[PDB]
Design a protein around this ligand. Structure first.
Ligand SMILES: C/C=C\NC(=O)[C@H]1NC(=O)[C@H](CC(N)=O)NC(=O)[C@@H](NC(=O)C(=O)[C@H](C)CC)Cc2ccc(O)c(c2)-c2cccc3c2NC(=O)[C@@]3(O)[C@@H]1O
Ligand SMILES: [Mg+2]
Ligand SMILES: [Mg+2]
Lengths: 243, 212, 246, 239, 249, 222, 233, 231
């Protein structure tokens, strides 16, 4: 009957690879570039909008950076709708942890929950995996600031600076070249902006094609999503653009 | 019903009566209230007859399963907690069972657990359960010593069951006596209360109020 | 509702999904386990690809199931977390229902049964992970080391490696592991572990990660500095051997 | 490819997965059982993959009950659930009837699980392991059964399964008689295993076990098996 | 029963999701529909191409009301649009009004319909929706908004855009003609001009649908006496109004 | 208001001999102060030399007997037609009864037959399955009237050797089949005399190593 | 059913040398109100079985439908439904009794007392009883309700044992049944003068008499009864 | 060809192939013959051993004291169907105090197999059955095929070389149909019928199984020395 139409998403290749996982990674390779950099006093997320038009309302547009929690945010690379499904689930899990323990959820717990959801989609159900890669930028009182990365394979890793999406190899090479363990948050902003401007397939890096976020620090952290005017200001300040 | 079990230097002594009553009518006096779970574990049948018998036989089956799975004797704590979890899963459903699981293992030594239908699981040294638990408790607590010989401990358990059978109306029939060492349990005979009373009265100088 | 039989037999008698999971294990990082006289040592290779990783938050290859037993793995990281979580839950359940922590063989048997079930259920692919489970039984000082394979096969080992280039490290161990004289002290065991890894790691001590398990729940992961000291001693001895030959 | 049903009948009137599991068993380790009026002996080739493997952890002979033992040949991981079900069935029959379950009844209950596969009353694939179930009951005395993933079971006076089964079976067919003793059965199992094993048979790559009405199911420790191997060497060097 | 538990939309080795691209292509082959956001309201418009001249075009509405202040137009497969508008009308109550006592904001209703379409692209035994939606809404805190929803489940906020056959040309005309200081009538005029560019047949108030999310019309509320309750903002223009604004041009 | 239980009276008695067993019961079935039937047997042969009775609620008794006969049929079917030992039947009946632990079969159960050693055997079960093997056991309405009498004439209780001044008890012996039949008939006649629910007829099933035979005897009808 | 509403009174039945006789009044009582007349409580099944139901009339109609469905199902794929493979009285009984005991065990019984009377294929007389509790008993005389109290002594005077069945003629049994019906009409407040009577003879077959009435009633002595003790006029 | 993957797929000629593959599985099984007179019904089966150290697979199953069957093909499917038939006889005897009619048993088996020969994921049964019984109509012999076709016959045979036994029964029909009240003669007739289907084999006490049912004769199986008088 229906056996003739099953794509069998959760099967191994003769080489020992998950077909749909590799294909989702290839899909995300064509998506926008998102870069996270964790300095000693903050975390910076910078993403490039693949969808660009002169009539695109960028004021109310959020296609790359989403707030999971007052302490945790995510940069997205890939299918926006699958990412939003996973983001809704992550927000629900974070609030469940908050209701259970009366303490904000640690970053790795949420990251592992999302990664296990992704993994379960790659081992059973016969359903397609989520074509989304996440860069988590979070803060908690245990590990301080934290940068994580998760892919459709269900694997999650921790990074000082990381990039997902298009041209991740050149971005990672540039970061390894210019990253320093002692650098501050503004240095991370400059490094992320320069890496994006040097790894963008577009002509130039402008405010309309950028989303920016900073998790900074009292005993309180501030999660600031940059507005288009703030993005243009930081672009003209870091020397990438002229005004 | 009167059941007692206590651990001493020689091992564990278990002693039960054999009377089963439905009100004022003694249904039987040949009841075996010591359930031979396995050659190393014993259980006392106090409370609901069918409940205790059925669930302790099921406990023996589960112990055999554990031994087949782990190639090792099940610990007294493990079997007692199996029975406790079962009865707790059947809590409020109407089960009435106050039992003692007694065993002698290498890891735990001599060990006695009290498991009741209310889910209570208590590791102990001297336990009496049943309608005549008070009488056996009195006798034991008065004459208990860890340094008792096997003979003296057996006689003490038998005498406590005898006192219970005498005073308590719902306890009687005959006394079943077991001695549990590390190599397993040993049956030490069924003693008819009717004749045991006269024997103990003549030899002990007790029960002077009764005339014979 | 998805019950597609993915792990099925081939005309020659093979279950190709299990063998492909084994190949996925082969593509994973190398891990090794060695039995001492009073300890068990687990070594694991770290991906020397990117230097931007955060060593404080990245999940380590050696994971604790209970206070006395640890589990390393080779293969898909995503599939490993499922096994680790199930193993920890079963360890707590065995503590709760038995009032005695799991034996290493029991936890290994549970993991192997989970994997075998995953090799014989509909709509489910087998785990692309092969694990090494090491520890000490409760109230026992004898070392315990076991290996579990995606097919569900589990077996005890004096010393065993699984992952990339596992054949080379296994040859090294079969040459250098004396069953008659196991590594007496912890230092000898850790040195043998690092020597086993150095035949394949080739890059440096930062890739090698070491964990030591000693009886009564004495589990400690060695810092990169101590591992580097061990590698430096081994390299100095190697130079001494190259100069004595001359 | 994977485009036909797992319960599909071959044009010759056979199930694909059953025959393929039989092939998988043919690719397994050797297991030989011999039944005599004094007991049933089961021997298995451990077939360790590397010298670093501890041969003690190769349990290919298991105890179903005091009166029923079982040896496996093939995908031994698949046999874990089968052994668990067999043990549970034995203890459950004991609880229900205050008696030991008959050997043939246990073998039939185990075989009943074989064809419960297909596309939650079904599993994905048949088992990839054959079983030698030996035992003793008061009705039919000592019994040995071969249980296949085809749901079919046969009572053998002597049966060998796994790699090198054909030659071992022929040797059994020529060397077995109704007056064989227990020690003779042990020596015969040892000899045939040594013949079919690629490695030299010693007390570490082979394992012996027996089932007697008195002592039950006893797996021979390596020392007694080694002494029996020495006896067999003395018998062969002087024959 | 439904044995199609496996996904029908999977990743190709090229990384493309096949059924999503095919549904987007089917959308591109659909009748043009556009939306233009102004300073005092939003306008959505489309061509009412009928199958037969015997058919009554008024009985088939391509511009539907989702909530009293949120409407939607489409380009693609009519039946998919009908089932999506029904699902959206119901989800507006179940996942907002019945919980918060207020009509959902435009962004959240768009997100809910996008979640429906994403599940259609990912669930088992289903093909993605062969439509692209332009949803124009107004809420008190975010003001006026215009969103586009694609078969993939993605959505984007637009100052002005179009979809369908003449999508590219329409978008170019809007890029050339739009500004952030436009009144509602100016946006209606620009939409009518773009549609006249995108239509070959007759162009009158009887062959084009056009609705506006503008001011509150208390005459359409149906009851008087509650000052806090004001009229709905969604209003579909009558054929007479469209013909008047066409003769004006 | 619906009471799912009822009482049909009746009295059954089982005595175990050295090489025989006997299970007898009155044939009277009643309800309140009226007689429903004067010959409704409740002692059934279930095969394999196992006689069974479940006295009390006649519906529950018939149900339990039917279920046990079905269990014996399936036991023969599933286990190479193996004969069901009396202890195995007793354990199976315990499990059958305890299956309805919270909706008990309002019946006291008594089975009789021969054990594996060829000796007579009788097993008694309470409504929820508590089972015990006993030499003699009576159940039902007149149970309280018959069980003491048995103690005086079967187990020789309170009977001491004459002239020994109560020092030596009466030597226990194995009663012949004729003696146990005499005792059963006297017990049932006394029950008919003193109990209103016992009478009409007495049916005895005798299980020997040659099979099961019947013996019917009239009783008073008042 | 937890409480009967419309109720049917007594049913009586006995055995005779060649078969069985059953009878029941035609009254449906709404408690104390004699609400419905002409309510047939004897249901014939084939040419060898009659089922007499007493109790809740709704459950009686349910059992009627069940018996009709059982006949229809036995007719299916059965070329011998006319002969060897026709519904025997024992089959119909055992089915009804299983149903009654099941309904009892589910705590929702059929508030009825049923008497199945017929002749088997071999000519043997079958007479058995079931109730809402599932209790089954068989006797040469069987009755429900007040029947079991009053008709049973009169009917047992004719057939006290099985040995009296061969000696009892059809006329004697029918006369005894009519006398029992008259006695019930005398001393049963929920009885009816109109009743129905079925005779299942292994030779004559099934004879079904409806609209029968109680005749030869003695009421003259009522004229002499005055007051309750001391009164004379 | 391309229409043999499922039992849910119809061939262009209107043929369900998986059912024919099951029938072929039966054909390659052992030979079992059935024959009945007016008073008795006999099943004669030739059991087959793997080798000389193995036992002979049982081919006759007892369903009830008045009905039994012999199998040819997959023993597991035979056991499943015989267990279902036991359940149906048990249900009849418990709910209706009535011996199950053989014809109704055949109807139930037919519908049970058809349930498998029309639905996805389910394979047809792989065994043919010969059911003997004695109901109120008399002696009955039925042949059941996993296609769902059950046919009542005076005699028949299934398995390897079954055509010889079938032709023998066709020739000897008027002879054996009149063997009433003599069990041993019908047993010998069945033995001759099954011998008409032997090639390089001879009937021994170990390979022969017999089953007899009829009036005042419950379904009884004869194996081992019990068949020595018929060889
Ligand atoms: C035997 C050694 C220790 N146990 C006892 O000694 C105890 N049980 C018995 O005697 C008898 C056995 C017999 N053959 O008589 N059990 C029943 O009768 C059964 N009742 C029934 O079926 C009924 O509901 C009808 C009303 C009776 C015909 C089983 C049962 C059910 C629910 C219960 O809550 C209990 C027992 C129960 C629990 C705690 C203590 C006692 C219990 N019941 C009592 O009677 C007693 O008090 C006695 O102590
Ligand atoms: Mg009386
Ligand atoms: Mg009287």
């Amino acid at each position: 009957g229906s056996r003739r139409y099953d794509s069998r998403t959760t099967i191994f290749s003769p080489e020992g690879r998950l077909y749909q996982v590799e294909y989702a990674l290839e899909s995300i390779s064509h998506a926008g570039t998102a870069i996270g950099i964790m300095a000693s006093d903050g975390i910076v997320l910078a993403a490039e909008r693949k969808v660009t038009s002169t009539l695109l309302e960028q004021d109310t547009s959020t296609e790359k950076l989403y707030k999971l929690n007052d302490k945790i945010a995510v940069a997205v690379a890939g299918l926006t709708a699958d990412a939003e499904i996973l983001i809704n689930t992550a927000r629900i899990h974070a609030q469940n942890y908050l209701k259970t323990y009366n303490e904000d959820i640690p970053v790795e717990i949420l990251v592992r929950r999302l990664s296990d959801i992704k993994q379960g989609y790659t081992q059973h159900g016969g359903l397609r995996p989520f074509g989304v890669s996440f860069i988590y930028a979070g803060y908690d009182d245990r590990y301080g600031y934290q940068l994580y990365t998760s892919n459709p394979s269900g694997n999650y890793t921790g990074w000082k600076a990381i990039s997902v999406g298009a041209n991740t190899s050149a971005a990672q090479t540039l970061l390894q070249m210019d990253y320093k363990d002692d650098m501050k948050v503004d240095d991370a902003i400059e490094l992320a902006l320069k890496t994006l401007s040097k790894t963008t397939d577009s002509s130039a890096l402008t405010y309309d094609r950028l989303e920016f976020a900073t998790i900074r620090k009292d005993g309180e952290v501030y999660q600031k999503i940059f507005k288009p005017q703030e993005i243009k200001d930081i672009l003209v300040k870091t020397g990438i653009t002229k005004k | 019903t009167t059941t007692l079990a206590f651990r001493f230097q020689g091992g564990i002594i278990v002693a039960v009566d054999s009377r089963a009553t439905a009100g004022n009518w003694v249904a039987s006096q040949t009841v075996k209230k010591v359930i031979e779970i396995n050659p190393f574990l014993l259980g006392t049948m106090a409370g609901g007859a069918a409940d205790c018998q059925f669930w302790e036989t099921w406990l023996g089956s589960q112990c055999r399963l554990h031994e087949l799975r782990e190639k090792e004797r099940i610990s007294v704590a493990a079997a007692s907690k199996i029975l406790s979890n079962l009865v707790y899963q059947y809590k409020g459903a109407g089960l009435s069972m106050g039992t003692m699981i007694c065993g002698y293992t290498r890891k735990e030594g001599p060990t006695i657990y009290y498991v009741d239908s209310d889910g209570t699981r208590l590791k102990g040294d001297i336990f009496c359960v049943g309608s005549g638990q008070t009488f056996a408790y009195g006798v034991l607590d008065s004459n208990y010593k860890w340094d008792l010989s096997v003979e003296d401990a057996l006689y003490l358990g038998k005498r406590s069951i005898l006192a219970a059978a005498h005073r308590d109306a719902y306890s009687g029939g005959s006394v079943n006596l077991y001695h549990v060492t590390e190599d397993g349990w040993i049956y030490h005979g069924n003693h008819d209360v009717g004749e045991l009373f006269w024997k103990v009265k003549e030899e002990e100088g007790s029960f002077n109020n009764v005339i014979g | 509702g998805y019950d597609r039989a993915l792990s099925i037999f081939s005309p020659d008698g093979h279950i190709f999904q299990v063998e492909y999971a084994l190949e996925a294990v082969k593509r994973g990082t190398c891990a090794v386990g060695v039995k001492g006289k009073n300890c068990v040592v687990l070594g694991c290779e770290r991906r020397s690809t990117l230097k931007l990783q955060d060593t404080r938050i990245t999940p380590s290859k050696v994971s604790k199931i209970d206070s006395h037993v640890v589990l390393s793995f080779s293969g898909l990281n995503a599939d490993s977390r499922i096994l680790i979580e199930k193993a920890r839950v079963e360890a707590q359940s065995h503590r709760l229902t038995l009032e005695d922590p799991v034996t290493v063989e029991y936890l290994t048997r549970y993991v192997a049964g989970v994997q075998q079930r995953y090799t014989q259920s509909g709509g489910v692919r087998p785990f692309g992970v092969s694990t090494l489970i090491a520890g000490f039984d409760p109230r026992d000082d004898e070392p315990k080391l076991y290996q579990t394979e995606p097919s569900g096969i589990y077996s005890s080992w004096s010393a065993q490696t699984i992952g990339r280039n596992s054949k080379t490290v296994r040859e090294f161990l079969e040459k250098n592991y004396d069953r008659k004289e196991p590594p007496a002290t912890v230092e000898e065991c850790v040195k043998l572990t690092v020597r086993s890894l150095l035949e394949v790691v080739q890059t440096g001590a930062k890739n090698i990660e070491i964990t030591v398990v000693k009886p009564d729940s004495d589990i400690v992961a060695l810092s990169s500095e101590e591992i580097n000291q061990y590698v430096t001693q081994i390299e100095q001895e190697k130079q001494e051997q190259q100069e004595q030959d001359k | 490819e994977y485009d036909r049903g797992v319960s599909t009948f071959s044009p010759e009137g056979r199930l694909f997965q059953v025959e393929y599991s039989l092939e998988a068993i043919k690719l397994g380790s050797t297991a030989i059982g011999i039944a005599t009026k004094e007991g049933v002996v089961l021997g298995v080739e451990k077939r360790a993959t590397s010298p670093l493997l501890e041969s003690d952890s190769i349990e290919k002979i298991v105890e179903i009950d005091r009166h029923i033992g079982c040896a496996m040949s093939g995908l031994t991981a698949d046999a874990r659930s089968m052994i668990e079900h067999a043990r549970t069935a034995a203890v459950t029959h004991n609880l229900y009837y205050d008696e030991d379950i008959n050997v043939e009844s246990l073998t039939q209950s185990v075989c009943d699980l074989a064809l419960r596969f297909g596309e939650e009353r079904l599993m994905s694939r048949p088992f990839g392991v054959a079983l030698l179930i030996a035992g003793h009951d008061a009705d039919d005395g000592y019994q040995l059964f071969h249980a296949e993933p085809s749901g079919t079971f046969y009572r053998y006076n002597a049966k060998a399964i796994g790699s090198g089964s054909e030659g071992a079976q022929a040797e059994l067919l020529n060397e077995w008689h109704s007056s064989l003793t227990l020690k003779e059965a042990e020596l015969l199992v040892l000899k045939i295993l040594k013949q079919v094993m690629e490695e030299k048979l010693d007390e570490n790559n082979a394992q012996l076990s027996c089932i007697t009405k008195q002592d039950g199911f006893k797996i021979y420790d390596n020392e007694k098996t080694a002494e029996l191997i020495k006896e067999l060497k003395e018998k062969e060097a002087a024959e | 029963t439904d044995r199609y538990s496996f996904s029908l939309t999977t990743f190709s080795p090229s990384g493309k999701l096949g059924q999503i691209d095919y549904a987007l292509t089917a959308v591109k082959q659909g009748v043009t529909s556009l939306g233009i956001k102004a300073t005092n309201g939003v306008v959505i418009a489309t061509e009412k191409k009928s199958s037969s001249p015997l058919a009554m075009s008024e009985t088939l509405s391509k511009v539907s009301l989702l909530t009293p202040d949120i409407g939607a137009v489409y380009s693609g497969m009519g039946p998919d649009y009908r089932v999506l508008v029904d699902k959206s009308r119901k989800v507006a109550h179940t996942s907002y009004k019945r919980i918060y006592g207020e009509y959902p904001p435009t962004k959240l209703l768009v997100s809910e319909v996008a979640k429906i379409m994403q599940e259609a692209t990912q669930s088992g035994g289903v093909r993605p929706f062969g439509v692209s939606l332009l949803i124009a809404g107004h809420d008190e805190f975010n003001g006026f908004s215009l969103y586009q929803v694609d078969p993939s489940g993605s959505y984007f906020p637009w100052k002005a855009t179009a979809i369908g056959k003449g999508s590219v040309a329409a978008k170019t005309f809007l890029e050339k003609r739009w500004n952030d200081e436009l009144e509602l009538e100016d946006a209606i005029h620009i939409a009518l001009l773009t549609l006249k560019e995108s239509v070959e047949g007759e162009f009158n108030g009887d062959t084009i649908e056009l609705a506006i999310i503008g001011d509150e019309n208390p005459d359409l509320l149906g009851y008087t006496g509650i000052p806090t309750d004001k009229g709905p903002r969604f209003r579909k223009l009558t054929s007479q109004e469209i013909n008047d604004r066409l003769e004006a041009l | 208001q619906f009471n799912p239980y009822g009482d049909n009276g009746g009295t059954i008695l089982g005595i175990a001999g050295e090489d025989f067993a006997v299970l007898a019961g009155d044939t009277r079935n009643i309800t309140d102060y009226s007689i429903n039937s004067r010959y409704e047997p409740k002692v059934f042969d279930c095969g394999d030399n196992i006689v069974m009775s479940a006295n009390g609620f006649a519906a529950d008794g018939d149900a339990l007997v039917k279920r046990f006969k079905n269990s014996v049929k399936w036991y023969h079917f599933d286990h190479n037609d193996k004969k069901l030992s009396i202890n195995s039947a007793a354990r199976n009946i315990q499990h059958l009864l305890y299956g309805k632990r919270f909706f008990p079969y309002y019946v006291h159960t008594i089975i009789a037959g021969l054990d594996e050693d060829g000796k007579g055997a009788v097993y008694s079960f309470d409504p929820v399955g508590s089972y015990e093997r006993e030499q003699c056991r009576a159940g039902g309405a007149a149970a309280s009237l018959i069980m003491p009498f048995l103690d005086n004439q079967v187990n020789f209780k309170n009977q001491y050797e004459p002239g020994t001044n109560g020092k030596v008890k009466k030597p226990l012996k194995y009663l012949s089949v004729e003696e146990v039949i005499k005792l059963v008939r006297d017990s049932f006649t006394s029950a008919t005399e003193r109990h209103i629910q016992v009478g009409d007829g007495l049916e005895i099933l005798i299980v020997t190593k040659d099979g099961v035979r019947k013996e019917f005897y009239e009783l008073k009808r008042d | 059913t937890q409480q009967p509403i419309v109720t049917g009174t007594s049913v009586i039945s006995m055995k005779y040398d060649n078969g069985v006789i059953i009878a029941a009044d035609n009254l449906g009582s709404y408690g104390s109100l004699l609400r419905f007349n002409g309510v047939e409580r004897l249901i014939p099944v084939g040419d060898n079985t009659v089922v007499g139901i007493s109790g809740d009339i709704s459950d009686m109609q349910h059992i009627e439908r069940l018996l009709k469905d059982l006949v229809t199902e036995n007719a299916y794929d059965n070329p011998l439904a006319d002969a060897e493979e026709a519904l025997e009285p024992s089959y119909i009984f055992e089915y009804l009794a299983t149903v009654m005991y099941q309904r009892r065990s589910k705590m929702n019984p059929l508030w009825n007392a049923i008497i199945v009377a017929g002749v088997q294929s071999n000519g043997d007389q079958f007479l058995r009883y079931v109730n809402l509790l599932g209790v089954t008993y068989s006797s040469p005389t069987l009755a429900t309700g007040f029947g079991a109290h009053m008709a049973n002594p009169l009917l047992r005077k004719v057939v006290d044992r099985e040995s009296d069945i061969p000696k009892t003629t059809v006329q004697v049994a029918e006369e005894a049944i009519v006398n029992a019906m008259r006695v019930l009409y005398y001393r049963d407040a929920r009885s009816s003068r109109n009743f129905s009577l079925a005779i299942i003879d292994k030779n004559t077959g099934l004879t079904f008499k409806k609209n029968l009435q109680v005749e030869n009633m003695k009421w003259d002595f009522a004229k002499d009864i005055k007051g309750y003790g001391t009164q004379k006029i | 060809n391309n229409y043999d993957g499922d039992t849910v797929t119809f061939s262009p000629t209107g043929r369900l192939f998986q059912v024919e593959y099951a029938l072929e599985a039966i054909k390659q099984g052992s030979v079992t013959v059935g024959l009945r007179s007016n008073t008795h019904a006999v099943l004669v089966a030739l059991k087959r051993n793997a080798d000389e150290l193995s036992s002979y697979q049982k081919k006759i199953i007892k369903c009830d004291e008045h009905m039994g069957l012999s199998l040819a093909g997959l023993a597991p499917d035979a056991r499943v169907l015989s267990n279902y038939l036991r359940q149906q006889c048990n249900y009849s005897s418990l709910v209706f105090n009535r011996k199950l009619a053989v014809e109704r048993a055949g109807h139930l088996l037919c519908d049970k197999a058809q349930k498998n020969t029309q639905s996805y994921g389910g394979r047809p049964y792989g065994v043919g059955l010969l059911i003997i019984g004695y109901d109120k109509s008399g002696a009955h012999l039925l042949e059941f095929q996993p296609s769902g076709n059950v046919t009542e016959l005076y005699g028949t045979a299934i398995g390897a070389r079954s055509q010889g036994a079938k032709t023998y029964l066709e020739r000897t029909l008027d002879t054996f149909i009149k063997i009433d009240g003599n069990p041993d003669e019908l047993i010998k007739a069945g033995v001759e019928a099954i011998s008409q289907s032997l090639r390089d084999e001879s009937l021994t006490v170990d390979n022969l199984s017999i089953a007899i049912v009829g009036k005042d004769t419950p379904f009884t199986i004869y194996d081992g020395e019990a068949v020595a008088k018929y060889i």
